Design a binder for these strands. Structure first.
Lengths: 149, 98, 129, 91, 83
RNA sequence: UAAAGUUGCUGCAGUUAAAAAGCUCGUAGUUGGAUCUUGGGAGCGGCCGUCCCCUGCUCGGCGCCGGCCCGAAGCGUUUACUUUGAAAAAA
RNA sequence: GUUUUCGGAACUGAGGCCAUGAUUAAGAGGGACGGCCGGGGGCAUUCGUAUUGCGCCGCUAGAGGUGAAAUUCUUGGACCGGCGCAAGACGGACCAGAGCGAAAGCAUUUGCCAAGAAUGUUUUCAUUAAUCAAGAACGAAAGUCGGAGGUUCGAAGACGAUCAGAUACCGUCGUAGUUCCGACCAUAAACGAUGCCGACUGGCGAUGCGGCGGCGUUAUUCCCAUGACCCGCCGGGCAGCUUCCGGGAAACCAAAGUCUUUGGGUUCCGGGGGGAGUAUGGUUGCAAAGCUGAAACUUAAAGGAAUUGACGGAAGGGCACCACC
């Protein structure tokens, strides 16, 4: 049941029962951790890192080869992005709409779509504030957001 | 093909060595330090032709930008508009590999 | 969404009992659910039930008989003293002979008559007869 | 403080000229006095010099624009129409 | 039909139920040991790869993404394995 | 006042009888998934019932040959909840 | 006098040690990515007859319209046939108990822009959620304000008939409007007369998108692989059929069921009929109007479903010279 849609879909991953390393995986903890670092220094969100790792090197879950998950490995070293990637891609979507909304101000649907983004941005803000990964003086502002890509 | 460039410039801003501004970048061309030059489309026509001449002698690539100088500041993640740009060290960004 | 997890469990095994199935499946398995079914286990109201511990919130496959009339759930968990427990079974059970009101107390989860031995009271979950 | 409620820039006419005339000049009084972003330098310095011409106090580059606005709507469809006929007259 | 053995389902229909609606939710994807005739090394690629992977030395593309299972490039040799 | 389950907490109704906002967002409000200690033992009766236990760290006497037992004081996440007690003017 | 042995208190330095510190990844949610899908949205662009007008040409006295006529056009050549040009609407047939969208709503081609469900996922975050007073966006048609345009249609009005009367239905003209752009307006039988979220409870054949598997057939051509069919399965999507699930006053309802065996969470809201969505006050609006919203008084019924009758300028059969031919 989506939160800004009438769709009640059901489609996501289902992790297998066994929580151990794949028997064909001959990669070590340090080798995996430095593999995440290579994607980290060249720029890649925690989500897309886990993508290219389960397609070329073939890791089931980095939580199972290493005792941590992707973001906790990046925050441990200092390769983590400052503001979270779900809040990043919502902002990247909100500034894309407003730029399109700048030339199409008759497009009343894109105005309705923008409020749904703003509702989901101002929801993730006051969540991350309580988890202290965002400072309490951090407030989203539409005009200044275009810099923060 | 622009968002690749926009993602590339962002990676140069946090990792690479960049030089913002016409007078500062013309100092970089003349030392042979610069590796790529970015020019907004609304750059003055004499300057645009001056930079391309300089980089032609220094053998530096000039990627003529699409948008204007206002949004190129927002491309470079700054709140002041920029008219020319030079990337001294690409950092770990594959912006000149393309 | 799923606010009360015990409630959607008890009504699930109540519908299958009305239809007359032999064993129904409950999607979540909490600590409160097992401590509920084992209350009905001792009184002989359901057959031998077993849970499946996966690496998520478990599921349960209880065994049913034709004995249970209804296993409804009181919501929310009300405060129940000992001077008003007979004011609860007066209007929530069929008669004074059979039927039970399971209620949680600091001693644990047990029916209303067990709490008369231990003289203790607490919140109320549901009831079956 | 918000000094006036609905009568904006056209509160300089006090009570004169009637509501409607004051209202339909307000959309023009605002626009003709506003500073636009000069498309040649990016700076918001485009200021209407006289009726028709618009001067940028950053480049000193005058532009023959609209009478109250910088670009009249009827001129920007023409420029797009010209840009389409030009490219088809000779491929 | 009232009595069903919900405890021990039959595997011909257990593969039919949804990946989350099984008794123990298990994926319907896997991995395999691939090799292109344009190489000889063995790599391991997902079945729903959703990204393009080339061989070392720029030999020949190994898989192509689709909406479901990643289309294994024809002519290639593969061996489905598991843990 | 009961009747009045015609004010409905217990306990009303809202497809057509009175009746769900045109629709969506949304703050207070309200409500919120699972997950962190069970079992073993001793006492007795015809496999079960019941008692018991998994508390820690100064001052004095059933005493014993620094060490043991025992009585006494304090501390050892906090509320909700629950039981006990006190305190509670009569009429 | 003095430092300490001394109890107590604070601070700095070296460590040793912890089984050294992070539950799981919801048939909860957000996000990423993958190939798609769609009368979803915006901007541009293109095309199609038709309609009306104009021009030229042909031949001619009627044409229109009606139940019947007349108003109206017409030898100044109407109507009708031909060839063109112009203008503004419109997007037939294909078009469906099909899709999409929050709803209102959305259909010539092409390009652009940004958005989205669903599926697929051994990707990520890790409870971020549900419903929501106040508040905010959108909201058909009509109506309003400026422009631009004004073919057809057509409130108002004018006439011709009909009629006892017809300022009505029918007909001929015809203004605002219908069209676009920009501002307002915020109501519809805005209806599924059915809040949203969640769980559970019969089958059945289809359908739409995505995925998986499978004989064969047929395209590429030169096969695999992708299309088109064929046979199943899964996800959710609009629906139908079916029945003693169950409920309901019943019509009917797989939800309107899981309701005296009454309690999943949560808004909105009804209290006999009128008076009355009226008065008033507030408040929004350019106005029309919207939102909020009484009482005095009056009344024994008003109403819902269903049954039988009678009735029908309703239908289908049939019959009578107290009916007709």
């Amino acid at each position: 049941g989506r939160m800004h849609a009438p769709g009640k879909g059901l489609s996501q991953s289902a992790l297998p029962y066994r929580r151990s390393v794949p028997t064909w995986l001959k990669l070590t903890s340090d080798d995996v951790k430095e593999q995440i670092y290579k994607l980290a220094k060249k720029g890649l969100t925690p989500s897309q890192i886990g993508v290219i790792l389960r397609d070329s090197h073939g890791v089931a879950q980095v939580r199972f080869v290493t005792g941590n998950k992707i973001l906790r490995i990046l925050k441990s070293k200092g390769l983590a992005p400052d503001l979270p990637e779900d809040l990043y891609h919502l902002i990247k979507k909100a500034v894309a709409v407003r730029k399109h909304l700048e030339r199409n101000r008759k497009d009343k649907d894109a105005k309705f779509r923008l409020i749904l983004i703003e509702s989901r941005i101002h929801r993730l803000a006051r969540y991350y504030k309580t988890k202290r990964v965002l400072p309490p003086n951090w407030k989203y502002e539409s005009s200044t957001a275009s810099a923060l890509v | 093909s622009l968002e690749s460039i926009n993602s590339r410039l962002q990676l140069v801003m946090k990792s690479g060595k960049y030089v913002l501004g016409y007078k500062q970048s013309l100092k970089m061309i003349r030392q042979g330090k610069a590796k790529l030059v970015i020019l907004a489309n609304n750059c003055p026509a004499l300057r645009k032709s001056e930079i391309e001449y300089y980089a032609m002698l220094a053998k530096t690539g000039v990627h003529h930008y699409s948008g204007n100088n206002i949004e190129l500041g927002t491309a470079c993640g700054k709140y002041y508009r920029v008219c020319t740009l030079s990337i001294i060290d690409p950092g770990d960004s594959d912006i000149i590999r393309s | 969404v799923r606010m009360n997890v015990l409630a959607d469990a008890l009504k699930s095994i109540n519908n299958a009992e009305k239809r007359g199935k032999r064993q129904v499946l409950i999607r979540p398995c909490s600590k409160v659910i097992v401590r509920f079914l084992t209350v009905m286990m001792k009184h002989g109201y359901i057959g031998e039930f077993e849970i499946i511990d996966d690496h998520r919130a478990g599921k349960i496959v209880v065994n049913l008989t034709g004995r249970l009339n209804k296993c409804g759930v009181i919501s929310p968990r009300f405060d129940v003293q000992l001077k008003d427990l007979e004011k609860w079974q007066n209007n929530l059970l069929p008669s004074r002979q059979f039927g039970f009101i399971v209620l949680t107390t600091s001693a644990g989860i047990m029916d209303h008559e067990e709490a008369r031995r231990k003289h203790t009271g607490g919140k109320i979950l549901g009831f079956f007869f | 403080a918000k000094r006036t409620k609905k009568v904006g820039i056209v509160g300089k006419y006090g009570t004169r000229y009637g509501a409607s005339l004051r209202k339909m000049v307000k959309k023009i009084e605002i626009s003709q006095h506003a500073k636009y972003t000069c498309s040649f330098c990016g700076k918001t310095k485009m200021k209407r010099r006289a009726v028709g011409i618009w001067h940028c106090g950053s480049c000193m580059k005058t532009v023959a624009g609209g009478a109250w606005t910088y670009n009249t709507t009827s001129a920007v469809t023409v420029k797009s129409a010209i840009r389409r006929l030009k490219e088809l007259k000779d491929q | 039909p009232l009595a069903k053995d919900l405890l021990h389902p039959s595997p011909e229909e257990e593969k039919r139920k949804h990946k989350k609606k099984r008794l123990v939710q298990s994926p319907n994807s896997y991995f395999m040991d691939v090799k292109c005739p344009g190489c000889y090394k063995i790599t391991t690629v997902f079945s729903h790869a959703q990204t393009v992977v080339l061989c070392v030395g720029c030999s020949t593309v190994l898989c192509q993404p689709t909406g479901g299972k990643a289309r294994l490039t024809e002519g290639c040799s593969f061996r489905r394995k598991q843990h």
